[PDB]
Amino acid sequence: EDRFQELVDSLKPRTAHQYKTYYTKYIQWCQLNQIIPTNSVPYKDLPISAELIHWFLLDTLITDDKPGEKREETEDLDEEEENSFKIATLKKIIGSLNFLSKLCKVHENPNANIDTKYLESVTKLHTHWIDSQKAITTNETNNTNTQVLCPPLLKVSLNLWNPETNHLSEKFFKTCSEKLRFLVDFQLRSYLNLSFEERSKIRFGSLKLGKRDRDAIIYHKVTHSAEKKDTPGHHQLLALLPQDCPFICPQTTLAAYLYLRFYGIPSVSKGDGFPNLNADENGSLLQDIPILRGKSLTTYPREETFSNYYTTVFRYCHLPYKRREYFNKCNLVYPTWDEDTFRTFFNEENHGNWLEQPEAFAFPDKIPFDFKKIMNFKSPYTSYSTNAKKDPFPPPKDLLVQIFPEIDEYKRHDYEGLSQNSRDFLDLMEVLRERFLSNLPWIYKFFPNHDIFQDPIFGNSDFQSYFNDKTIHSKGSPILSFDILPGFNKIYKNKTNFYSLLIERP
Amino acid sequence: WIDSQKAITTNETNNTNTQVLCPPLLKVSLNLWNPETNHLSEKFFKTCSEKLRFLVDFQLRSYLNLSFEERSKIRFGSLKLGKRDRDAIIYHKVTHSAEKKDTPGHHQLLALLPQDCPFICPQTTLAAYLYLRFYGIPSVSKGDGFPNLNADENGSLLQ
């Protein structure tokens, strides 16, 4: 009861009523999912947690599906002010609900527990996204020409699809398989902002599919019941949603690297063998296969050899490499959890009184929605992604079932008789092969002699027919077809800037 | 010089025909007479005159194997001529009775003959560098003027 005045006299009244507006929105929204049920307005009842706050922020700020107000974000002068308004009001809503969190303490509502640093990470995430879209604002933002206009991802990425690295490395990168394992680790650190150790710890068994999403690539990284602490929960959840660009897609890169790793060239690149998966145990084989390998078959390749790799590549594309900023940890990272809320909040039956459960929409398969789309370099502003029907020429499965057909055998094998992770990984691989054949014609369009095309079954005119399908206007068009990057569209969809990316035969 | 010949006596002295068979001064010079350095830099390569002072310094290192600390010790009048030549640019070196020892001589004579390749010709490159250092571009690069020569007595201003 001592908390009266210093709560009250903490603020300007103007501040207090802006905060009152914001928590009034919060209360109405919790009644909109009847969390507080239906003026019915107590204080020792209203739950405050970082995910609750966060999902309120989702449902109000970012959820611009909203067809009455759909396309303010398209106009540059509207969005350039609108997102600044978003982030300012974001910070104010954070302060408001922090104030309300302290308010529930003086009423003694134990249901209010903040963990601001999670919401600080939300703040930092949206801050970095708006600063990314802000630094990209103009060709002549300042007197720069092409290096503001040089994404360190794509200039590397596209130039890694070349079957030759002649000035670069005959010492290192003869094989395209080594180029693809480099591109795999680079798109790891690109999409999944991690450390070298965190890049090391990917078995195949921690690579799952979207439950409510079909497209999520779940790396359900959990502390294994012992760091100093049992009850294993430190949950780090990640995703590799594909890219409309067929050359920075993680799924395309992954399917390509695993094709060369498993099958490769039938003469030259004799693969590592498509795995057993028959008397596999859940945890036996997929929990042994590294996502990438060198000479060893189980562990992860050598650290300073990767340092050499990144050094050679960033001197090839002439970019400032700094080793801490890829091998050591950043803080621009993914959400982190307990066991407590993770089991508690994602259980629907504890919240089954509600009209909706947040696992459905704003948490696509236990992922905070902006931590999905920002890390996958997307404007996070629909909550209702329906871009999946955008598919000129969906590829035929008869071409698909040529490579990796053992998967098709395994589901015509005793599908029960295989381990649970195994067939789930098999369906993962089929989605990978689908995305692979989908993105294949531009790979043929730009490097027709990759080691994938050291296989004349692809040289047959069924694949070439599908190549002429997807690359149909490519010879006649001045510009490209596929998407680029949210602030690099009007530069590199031009074929010429796209060819300035190439150094060896544009 | 036999080492130069030994590297040059076979085009398969080194199996690559890509970078290892290029002589070092030539690769630097030809990609340093380029105006644009777009993949390279502008933050340490603003002007073409910054590129020229880099290129003149590297050609000094290439022809006259000094330290940069010894390339510090070159003035305008530190450069004489082969008077039987008009070809060499004579750095006549200083040990004049107090920098190492009395009874002066520890001297060293340095030749800077031109090259028929004008990209690596050091006389050409220094002429261009001092042209743009002094006169500059008549529209943009405000050079710092032709030397005075009038206040210079021997060992006073050019030195």
How would you write A113-166 as a 3-class SS string?
CCCHHHHHHHHHHHHHHHHHHHHCCCCCCCCCCCCCCCCHHHHHHHHCCCCCCC
Provide, as residue numbers in chain B, all residues whose Cβ is less than 8 Å from the Cβ of A170: 16
A315, amino acid identity: R
Least CA distance to B40: which residue of chain A? A318
DSSP secondary structure letter of residue A208: B
Portions of chain A given CATH number 1.10.150.130: 18-136
Dist. CA A328–CA A194, nearest whole Å: 8
Identify all chain A residues contacting B16, using CB atoms and an 8 Å cutoff: 170
Name the residue among A149, A158, A147 with its Cα closest to residue A506: A158
CA angle, residues A221, A225, A231, in degrees to nearest 5: 105
Question: Angle at which helices A250-262 and A176-191 pack, to 10 degrees?
Answer: 150
Residue B148 forms contact with A (CB below 8 Å): no
Asked if B18 lies within 8 A of A318 by C-beta distance, the reply is: no
What are the structure tokens assigned to A449, written together?
């002699």
Which whole-number Å values give the CA distances from B78 to B73, B74, B91, in the listed order? 8, 6, 6
Using a 10 angstrom Cβ sphere, with 0-12 exposed, 13-18 middle and 19 or more buried, the burial of residue A40 is exposed
Interface contact flag, A167 B18, Cβ < 8 Å? yes
Q: How far apart are CA A261 and CA A270, in angstroms?
A: 8
In Å, the largest CA–CA distance within chain B is 58
Q: Do A166 and B18 touch (CB under 8 A)?
A: yes
A142 touches B at CB < 8 Å: no
Q: Judge whether A231 and A339 are in contact, CB under 8 Å.
A: yes
* CB A84 within 8 Å of CB A292: no
Residues of A in contact with B18 (CB under 8 A): 166-167
Contacts of A145 in chain B (CB under 8 A): 38
Half-sphere exposure (CA, 13 Å, Cβ side) for A194? Answer: 21
H/E stretch holding A235 reads: strand A235-236
Residue B32's CB is within 10 A of a number of other CB atoms, namely: 19
Nearest one of B79, B61, B59 to B70, comparing CA atoms: B61
The answer to whether the beta carbons of residues A222 and A230 sit under 8 Å apart is no
Quick check: A167 and B39 CB within 8 A? no
Quickly tell me which residue has 């790799």 as its tokens: A309
* Residue B40 with chain A: CB contacts under 8 Å: 318
Among B16, B19, B40, the residue with its CB nearest the CB of A318 is B40
User: Closest partner residue to A167 among B19, B39, B40, by Cβ?
Assistant: B19
Contact A193, A374 (CB under 8 A): no
Instruction: Tell me the count of A-B CB pairs closer than 8 A.
Output: 10
Cα B157 to chain centroid, rounded: 21
Shortest CA gap A170–chain B (Å)? 10
Q: How far apart are CA A38 and CA A35, in angstroms?
A: 9
SS3 category, A411: coil
The angle subtended at Cα A284 by Cα A183 and Cα A264, nearest 5°, is 35
B15 touches chain A (CB under 8 A): no
Show the tokens assigned to A314: 């960033």
Is residue B154 within 8 angstroms of chain A, CB to CB?
A: no
Q: Compute the distance between CA of residue B127 and CA of residue A295 in angstroms, rounded to an integer.
A: 56
Resolution (A): 4.4
Q: How many CA atoms lie within 13 A of A220 on its CB side?
A: 17
**Is residue A449 less than 8 Å (CB to CB) from chain B?**
no
Domain A150-505 listed as CATH 3.40.50.10440: no
**A362 and A59 Cβ atoms separated by less than 8 Å:** yes
- Which residue from A24, A52, A48, A429 is spatially nearest to A257, judged by alpha carbons? A429
Within 10 Å of residue A197's Cβ, how many Cβ atoms? 12
Rounded to a whole number, what is the distance in Å from the CA of B98 to chain A's nearest CA?
Answer: 47
Say if the Cβ atoms of B19 and A170 lie within 8 Å: no
In chain A, which residues fall in CATH 1.10.443.20? 150-505
Q: Does domain A18-136 have CATH number 3.90.1150.10?
A: no
Q: By the 8 A CB rule, do A371 and A361 touch?
A: no
**A479-503 exposure pattern, b = at least 16 Cβ within 10 A, e = fewer:** ebbebbbebbeebbbeeebbebbeb
Helix, strand, or coil (residue A183)? helix
Q: How far is A306 from chain B (nearest CA, A)?
A: 23
- Is B53 in a helix, a strand, or coil? helix
Whole-angstrom distance, CA of residue A196 vs CA of residue A500: 31
CA separation for the pair A85, A64 (Å, rounded):
14
Facing A146 at nearest CB: one of B16, B19, B38: B38
Q: What does the alpha-carbon distance between residue A361 and residue A382 come to, in Å, rounded to a whole number?
A: 11
Question: Running DSSP on this structure, what letter comes out for residue A222?
Answer: E
